[PDB]
Design a protein around this ligand. Structure first.
Ligand SMILES: C=C/C=C/[C@@]1(C)SC(=O)C(C)=C1O
Ligand SMILES: C=C/C=C/[C@@]1(C)SC(=O)C(C)=C1O
Lengths: 404, 403
C-alpha cells in the first residue's frame, strides 16, 4: 500500500477567505458568526450564521459559473487556492488519467431546487427555470462543477455523509492512492448558506436560538448553556498525493494521512450512539506509533452530542487524553464543508505549532471534567493530530494526520 | 482480494422484485406510462417510468418517518437483497465488517421544496416539521438504511448523477479489496416527481414527441429518438468477499472482475467519448475473457447514444459484443440506474438470455455494423459489461463474470 500526503490546501470560510486569513482568526480566537437578516426574515428562530464574507462576482469565468450553486463556487475557489499552494500547473494535473477529484456537499443546493420549483410554477414555466438548475441542484454538483473546468481525467464523484461528507471525501482519496489508482486526488467539498436549507435544521430544533442578540457567543461548544449549532457555509479542498510522486517533484508536504476511520452507529438517526465513534477513532489510530497530540473535535455545540463525543474520547484514550478544541465555536457548522475545513484547521495548527482555542466556554459542562480542553491559544510543537466528523444517519469519519 | 455478488433486490418500473423484472426483460415489456403529474406541472414531457407499487405501510412508521421515496425504494430493495443473500440478522447486524454504500442523484427535490413552501406559509417552522433534513439531504439513501439495518461498517453515499449507484458498487468492491469489509450493501434509489423532472425538461434532456404513445417514447438507437424518459425506483446488491461467501455457502451470481471510473474534463452535459473509452478499457484490465453482453448507458438522447457507440467501437474494434439498451423498456432512473442495470445484467447472466433493445423502428446510421440485439435471445453468457455515464463528465463501468 502507498502512503498519502497533503501537498496543498485551499479554504473559503466564515473565519477567512484563504489559509492566511484563517490562520489569523484561529490564533486570535476570532468568531466568524454574524446576525443574519435573511434567516430572521424567513420566520426562523435562529438568526445567526457562519457566512462567507467574500464578493465572488467575476472570480469565476462566466461560462463556468453559470452551472454552479454556491457550494460549487466555494469549492472551486478553494481548489484554485489548493492548486497554486501545491505548486501544480495545468500540464501536470490537467488531462491526466492519474489525477482525480472527490468532493461533495451535505445538501446539494436547496436554493436552486426551490428556485427551479418556484420558477416552474410561475406563468413562464420551463422558460423561467432555464437550462442550468440540474448542475446547480444535483447532489454531485460540487464534483461535476470542478472536474469539468479543471480538466480532470481520473476519478470524479461526490461522497455525501452529512456532517462527515468532506472527511469521507478525503479518506476515499487516500484509498485511491493506497490502491495505486491515482497519483493526485483533490478532496474536499462545499456547502451553500441559505434559509431554504437552514429552516430544515431549525424545524428539528438543531440550531441555536437563544443568543441571537450576541451572535459571536451563540456557538459555544462544551458550555453548559449551549442550545444547538450555528449553521455555516463555505468550502475547502486539499491535494492528496502519493508520497514518492510528491517527493520527486519537491512538493511542500504539510502531513501524511496516517489514519482514516469510517464507521456507522446503526442506532439513531439524529443522535450519536457513542460506540460508533469509539470504533472510528480506534480505526484511525491503528498502527500509528505516535500519540495524538491534538484532537479537533466534531463538537457542534449541542447538549447531547458534545458530551457523547467526550465520553467516546475518554473510552479510547483513558487518562492520557489529547488536547481538545472545538473550532466550530469560532466557525459554526458548515455541514458538508466541515470535514475538509477542520482537516485544514488541524493542518495549520500542525504546520504553525499551536492549538486554537475552544472559545465561549463561560461555564464548562460537568461532563467535560478530566480532559484537556484548550480554551486559550497555546503554542506547542505538535506531531500527530486527529479530526472527528460525525453526521446524521450515524455516519462517522476520523482523520489522523502526522508530520513526515 | 475478490468481490462477488451474493444477493440482489430491486424496485423498478418493470418489476417490484427480481422475478417480475426477469419476465419483463424476457418479454421486452415497457415500464413507461403517461403521467398526469408531469403534464399538470407545465412540462412538455408527460411520460415516466413509475414504480407500480403503493409503499404505504411496508416500512415501520418510526423508520419511514425519516425517509423520502429514494430511501423507501432502496430500503425495500435492501430487504430483498438480505433475504436473497440468505443473511440472518446475526450475520450482518451490529457487525463492523459489514457496510453500506448507497446514493441518489438528486436527494429529494420534493422535500427540499416542501420545506421551503411550508416555511413561507402561515405556520412556518411547525409546518416544516422535524423530518425534512433526513429526507432532503444528499446522503438520505445511506443514512436512512444504515440505521434501521443496524449497520456498523462503512456508511455513506456516492453521488455522480447517472453513474451514482454504479460508483457505489465499485467503491464497495474497493472496500473488499482493501480488506476493510467482508460485506457491503451497494446500490441506490431515486424519487420520481415533477420538482426534479422539470429541471431535465428545461434543459431539453427529456422526450416530448411521444406523449400519446408513452411506451414508444424511450427508443435508444432509433433515428427519431428525442431525449430520455425519467424514472424512479431503487436497487441493492450484496457485495461480498469471496472466501466469506464460499465459507457460508452463499449463492454467487458473479464476480466483479472489472471496475472503471473516469472523468471527461470536457463538457457539463454532453459526453466526450474519450472518457468512456478510458473507463471501459480500465474495467477490462486483466480481464481476458470476451464481453458476451454490454448493457449500455443508452438513454435515448441524439448525442449521447452514438457517442457511447463510438466509444464501444474504439474499445472493441471488430470484436464488439452483443448490445442492448434496457432504458428503452425501463426509462432512466438516474441514481438508481447503475444498480438496476447491473441487476438486469446479472439476471441475463444467471438465466442465459439477452434482453431486447426495443423501439428501434429505424436504426441510426451511426449504429450500422454493430450487434444491437432487438429480440430476446437465449445465449450462454459468461462475462457482461454495464456502462453508466452521468452529467459532469463522470463515468463508471462494471464487468461481471460467472464463476
Ligand atoms: C447520528 C446523528 C448525529 C448527530 C450529531 C451528533 S452530528 C451533528 O452535527 C449534530 C448537530 C448532531 O446532533
Ligand atoms: C457529461 C454529460 C453526459 C451526458 C449523458 C451521456 S449522461 C446521461 O444520462 C445523458 C442523458 C447524457 O446525455
Amino acid at each position: 500500500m502507498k502512503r498519502a500526503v497533503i501537498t496543498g490546501l485551499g479554504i473559503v470560510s466564515s473565519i477567512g477567505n484563504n489559509q492566511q486569513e484563517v490562520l489569523a482568526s484561529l490564533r486570535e480566537g476570532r468568531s466568524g458568526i454574524t446576525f443574519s437578516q435573511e434567516l430572521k426574515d424567513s420566520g426562523m428562530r435562529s438568526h445567526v450564521w457562519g457566512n462567507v464574507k467574500l464578493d465572488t462576482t467575476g472570480l469565476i469565468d462566466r461560462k463556468v459559473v453559470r452551472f454552479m450553486s454556491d457550494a460549487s463556487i466555494y469549492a472551486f475557489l478553494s481548489m484554485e487556492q489548493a492548486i497554486a499552494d501545491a505548486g501544480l500547473s495545468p500540464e501536470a494535473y490537467q488531462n491526466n488519467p492519474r489525477v482525480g477529484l472527490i468532493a461533495g456537499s451535505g445538501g446539494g443546493s436547496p436554493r436552486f431546487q426551490v428556485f427551479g420549483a418556484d420558477a416552474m410554477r410561475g406563468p413562464r414555466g420551463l422558460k423561467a427555470v432555464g437550462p442550468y438548475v440540474v448542475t446547480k441542484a444535483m447532489a454531485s454538483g460540487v464534483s461535476a462543477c470542478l472536474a469539468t473546468p479543471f480538466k480532470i481525467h481520473g476519478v470524479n464523484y461526490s461522497i455525501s455523509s452529512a456532517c462527515a461528507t468532506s472527511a469521507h471525501c478525503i479518506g476515499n482519496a487516500v484509498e485511491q492512492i493506497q490502491l495505486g489508482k491515482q497519483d493526485i486526488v483533490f478532496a474536499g467539498g462545499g456547502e451553500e448558506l441559505c434559509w431554504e436549507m437552514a429552516c430544515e435544521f431549525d424545524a428539528m430544533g438543531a440550531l441555536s436560538t437563544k443568543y441571537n442578540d450576541t451572535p459571536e457567543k451563540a456557538s459555544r461548544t462544551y458550555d453548559a448553556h449551549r442550545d444547538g449549532f450555528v449553521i455555516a457555509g463555505g468550502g475547502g479542498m486539499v491535494v492528496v498525493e502519493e508520497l514518492e510522486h510528491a517527493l520527486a517533484r519537491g512538493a511542500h508536504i504539510y502531513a501524511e494521512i496516517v489514519g482514516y476511520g469510517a464507521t456507522s452507529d446503526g442506532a439513531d438517526m439524529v443522535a450519536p450512539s457513542g460506540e460508533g465513534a469509539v470504533r472510528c477513532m480506534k480505526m484511525a489510530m491503528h498502527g500509528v506509533d505516535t500519540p495524538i497530540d491534538y484532537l479537533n473535535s466534531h463538537g457542534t455545540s449541542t447538549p447531547v452530542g458534545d458530551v457523547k463525543e467526550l465520553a467516546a474520547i475518554r473510552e479510547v484514550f483513558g487518562d492520557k487524553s489529547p488536547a481538545i478544541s472545538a473550532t466550530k465555536a469560532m466557525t459554526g457548522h458548515s455541514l458538508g464543508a466541515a470535514g475538509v475545513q477542520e482537516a485544514i484547521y488541524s493542518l495549520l495548527m500542525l504546520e504553525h505549532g499551536f492549538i486554537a482555542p475552544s472559545i465561549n466556554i463561560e461555564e464548562l459542562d460537568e461532563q467535560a471534567a478530566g480532559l484537556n480542553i484548550v480554551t486559550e491559544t497555546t503554542d506547542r510543537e505538535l506531531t500527530t493530530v486527529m479530526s472527528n466528523s460525525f453526521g446524521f444517519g450515524g455516519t462517522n469519519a476520523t482523520l489522523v494526520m502526522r508530520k513526515l
